[PDB]
Scaffold this active site. Sequence first.
Site, mmCIF file in Angstrom:
data_model
loop_
_atom_site.group_PDB
_atom_site.id
_atom_site.type_symbol
_atom_site.label_atom_id
_atom_site.label_comp_id
_atom_site.label_asym_id
_atom_site.label_seq_id
_atom_site.Cartn_x
_atom_site.Cartn_y
_atom_site.Cartn_z
ATOM 1 N N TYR A 111 -8.695 -3.549 1.791
ATOM 2 C CA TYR A 111 -8.201 -3.670 3.242
ATOM 3 C C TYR A 111 -7.776 -2.340 3.640
ATOM 4 O O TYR A 111 -7.517 -1.437 3.133
ATOM 5 C CB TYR A 111 -6.933 -4.677 3.242
ATOM 6 C CG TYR A 111 -5.702 -4.061 2.750
ATOM 7 C CD1 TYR A 111 -4.796 -3.568 3.559
ATOM 8 C CD2 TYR A 111 -5.343 -4.328 1.415
ATOM 9 C CE1 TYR A 111 -3.607 -2.913 3.145
ATOM 10 C CE2 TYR A 111 -4.414 -3.646 0.976
ATOM 11 C CZ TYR A 111 -3.362 -2.890 1.798
ATOM 12 O OH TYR A 111 -2.069 -2.255 1.104
ATOM 13 N N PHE A 121 -1.748 2.507 9.377
ATOM 14 C CA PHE A 121 -0.835 2.373 8.646
ATOM 15 C C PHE A 121 -0.912 2.192 7.018
ATOM 16 O O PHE A 121 0.077 2.763 6.309
ATOM 17 C CB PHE A 121 0.439 1.229 9.144
ATOM 18 C CG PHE A 121 -0.074 -0.151 8.921
ATOM 19 C CD1 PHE A 121 -0.025 -0.981 7.898
ATOM 20 C CD2 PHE A 121 -0.680 -0.645 9.946
ATOM 21 C CE1 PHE A 121 -0.518 -2.270 7.703
ATOM 22 C CE2 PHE A 121 -1.166 -2.000 10.184
ATOM 23 C CZ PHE A 121 -1.026 -2.873 8.935
ATOM 24 N N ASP A 122 -1.921 1.743 6.566
ATOM 25 C CA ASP A 122 -2.132 1.662 5.138
ATOM 26 C C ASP A 122 -3.672 1.075 4.930
ATOM 27 O O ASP A 122 -4.252 0.429 5.805
ATOM 28 C CB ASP A 122 -1.155 0.724 4.382
ATOM 29 C CG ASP A 122 -1.303 0.767 2.870
ATOM 30 O OD1 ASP A 122 -1.480 -0.135 2.275
ATOM 31 O OD2 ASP A 122 -1.057 1.955 2.493
ATOM 32 N N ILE A 141 2.057 -11.552 4.172
ATOM 33 C CA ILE A 141 2.665 -11.824 5.430
ATOM 34 C C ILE A 141 1.838 -13.125 5.864
ATOM 35 O O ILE A 141 0.611 -13.343 5.353
ATOM 36 C CB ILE A 141 2.514 -11.103 6.452
ATOM 37 C CG1 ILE A 141 0.879 -10.387 6.250
ATOM 38 C CG2 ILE A 141 3.501 -9.819 6.425
ATOM 39 C CD1 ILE A 141 0.817 -9.352 7.662
ATOM 40 N N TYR A 167 5.438 -8.798 10.314
ATOM 41 C CA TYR A 167 6.866 -8.306 10.102
ATOM 42 C C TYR A 167 7.836 -8.717 10.913
ATOM 43 O O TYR A 167 8.925 -8.370 10.885
ATOM 44 C CB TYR A 167 6.657 -6.988 9.456
ATOM 45 C CG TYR A 167 6.114 -6.755 8.467
ATOM 46 C CD1 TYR A 167 6.510 -7.027 7.130
ATOM 47 C CD2 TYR A 167 4.699 -6.100 8.217
ATOM 48 C CE1 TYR A 167 5.828 -6.720 6.021
ATOM 49 C CE2 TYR A 167 4.012 -6.132 7.422
ATOM 50 C CZ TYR A 167 4.204 -6.388 6.131
ATOM 51 O OH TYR A 167 3.743 -6.051 4.960
ATOM 52 N N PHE A 184 -6.182 -5.940 10.788
ATOM 53 C CA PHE A 184 -6.645 -5.612 9.186
ATOM 54 C C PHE A 184 -7.886 -5.966 9.300
ATOM 55 O O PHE A 184 -8.557 -6.911 9.645
ATOM 56 C CB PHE A 184 -6.049 -6.529 8.198
ATOM 57 C CG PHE A 184 -4.394 -6.497 7.976
ATOM 58 C CD1 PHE A 184 -3.560 -6.777 8.603
ATOM 59 C CD2 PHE A 184 -4.150 -5.369 6.809
ATOM 60 C CE1 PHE A 184 -2.151 -6.397 8.321
ATOM 61 C CE2 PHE A 184 -2.811 -5.136 6.482
ATOM 62 C CZ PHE A 184 -1.702 -5.634 7.329
HETATM 63 C C1 8ZV Z 1 9.876 -0.222 -0.184
HETATM 64 O O1 8ZV Z 1 9.434 0.988 0.015
HETATM 65 C C2 8ZV Z 1 8.945 1.560 1.538
HETATM 66 C C3 8ZV Z 1 7.364 1.213 1.686
HETATM 67 O O2 8ZV Z 1 7.545 0.066 2.162
HETATM 68 C C4 8ZV Z 1 6.342 -0.908 1.792
HETATM 69 C C5 8ZV Z 1 5.207 -0.157 1.569
HETATM 70 C C6 8ZV Z 1 4.172 -0.818 1.087
HETATM 71 O O3 8ZV Z 1 3.046 -0.470 0.415
HETATM 72 C C7 8ZV Z 1 2.846 0.785 -0.221
HETATM 73 C C8 8ZV Z 1 1.740 0.429 -1.168
HETATM 74 O O4 8ZV Z 1 1.332 1.799 -1.345
HETATM 75 C C9 8ZV Z 1 1.246 2.039 -2.810
HETATM 76 C C10 8ZV Z 1 4.099 -2.185 1.225
HETATM 77 C C11 8ZV Z 1 5.295 -3.039 1.635
HETATM 78 C C12 8ZV Z 1 5.459 -4.650 1.768
HETATM 79 O O5 8ZV Z 1 6.329 -5.106 2.566
HETATM 80 N N1 8ZV Z 1 4.472 -5.244 1.238
HETATM 81 C C13 8ZV Z 1 4.457 -6.699 1.281
HETATM 82 C C14 8ZV Z 1 3.092 -7.184 1.134
HETATM 83 O O6 8ZV Z 1 2.235 -6.591 2.178
HETATM 84 C C15 8ZV Z 1 1.709 -7.451 2.884
HETATM 85 O O7 8ZV Z 1 2.152 -8.529 3.002
HETATM 86 C C16 8ZV Z 1 0.629 -6.981 3.840
HETATM 87 C C17 8ZV Z 1 -0.725 -7.682 3.540
HETATM 88 C C18 8ZV Z 1 -1.190 -7.526 2.298
HETATM 89 C C19 8ZV Z 1 -1.810 -5.997 1.953
HETATM 90 C C20 8ZV Z 1 -0.421 -5.134 2.130
HETATM 91 N N2 8ZV Z 1 0.291 -5.690 3.417
HETATM 92 S S1 8ZV Z 1 0.839 -4.094 4.565
HETATM 93 O O8 8ZV Z 1 0.940 -4.686 5.959
HETATM 94 O O9 8ZV Z 1 -0.596 -3.164 4.505
HETATM 95 C C21 8ZV Z 1 2.077 -3.429 3.722
HETATM 96 C C22 8ZV Z 1 2.359 -2.293 4.263
HETATM 97 C C23 8ZV Z 1 1.994 -1.171 3.751
HETATM 98 C C24 8ZV Z 1 2.336 0.301 4.278
HETATM 99 C C25 8ZV Z 1 3.549 0.221 5.332
HETATM 100 C C26 8ZV Z 1 3.938 -1.158 5.805
HETATM 101 C C27 8ZV Z 1 3.453 -2.112 5.108
HETATM 102 C C28 8ZV Z 1 6.388 -2.096 1.946
#
Ligand code: 8ZV
Length: 191
Positions: A111, A121-122, A141, A167, A184
């Site tokens: 993704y 953002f990721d 989510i 979120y 996404f």
């Molecule tokens: C706590 O330390 C501060 C960093 O906070 C972060 C970082 C993070 O990823 C790092 C992984 O890298 C190794 C995940 C998260 C987070 O809440 N996960 C929950 C699951 O996620 C989701 O449900 C969605 C949909 C599935 C694919 C991922 N996603 S997302 O939308 O791309 C999640 C995302 C990614 C980057 C920024 C903001 C959100 C928080």
Amino acid sequence: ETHINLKVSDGSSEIFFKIKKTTPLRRLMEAFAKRQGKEMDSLRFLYDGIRIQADQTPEDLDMEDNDIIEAHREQIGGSTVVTTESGLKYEDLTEGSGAEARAGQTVSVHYTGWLTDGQKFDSSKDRNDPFAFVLGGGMVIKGWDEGVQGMKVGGVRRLTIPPQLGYGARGAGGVIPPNATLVFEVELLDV
Ligand SMILES: COCCOc1cc(OCCOC)cc(C(=O)NCCOC(=O)[C@@H]2CCCCN2S(=O)(=O)Cc2ccccc2)c1
């Protein structure tokens, strides 16, 4: 002015190009595909609704500075944006041919996520690390639990997730702001 600036959007992100007005658009089209990782996806580039040929120049198409070129994967049967009862939007950029993902399965995906302004953002592809989660379990989510269901293995689906299915007021990860609509592209690798 001998040069022209052009923006290419694929509905997910955008890239800006500066090229000579008498230069065929072929190089711009290939450069966009390479940077977005969509070279083998057979993209089509449209200007004012008409497909661009590689040998055509912005002069041929009477383009003006900062015109926009729309790029998309060729869609058999036309482009179709689906809006569900919840407000989730999805678009099957590539329909998979494999088994269908259903709630309760541990699925694996690649993704990339963007804000609506095109800022990434990721991306699991940036880490060469597929992402697995139990579909329908509330571990992601709500837009993902709803939107990934029904994908087939091999498919690429673009989800446009309103804030209350993402979120919400909190945001996430110090990058996703409050009240953010999320975009996404999800490729289903296994179910
Ligand atoms: C706590 O330390 C501060 C960093 O906070 C972060 C970082 C993070 O990823 C790092 C992984 O890298 C190794 C995940 C998260 C987070 O809440 N996960 C929950 C699951 O996620 C989701 O449900 C969605 C949909 C599935 C694919 C991922 N996603 S997302 O939308 O791309 C999640 C995302 C990614 C980057 C920024 C903001 C959100 C928080």
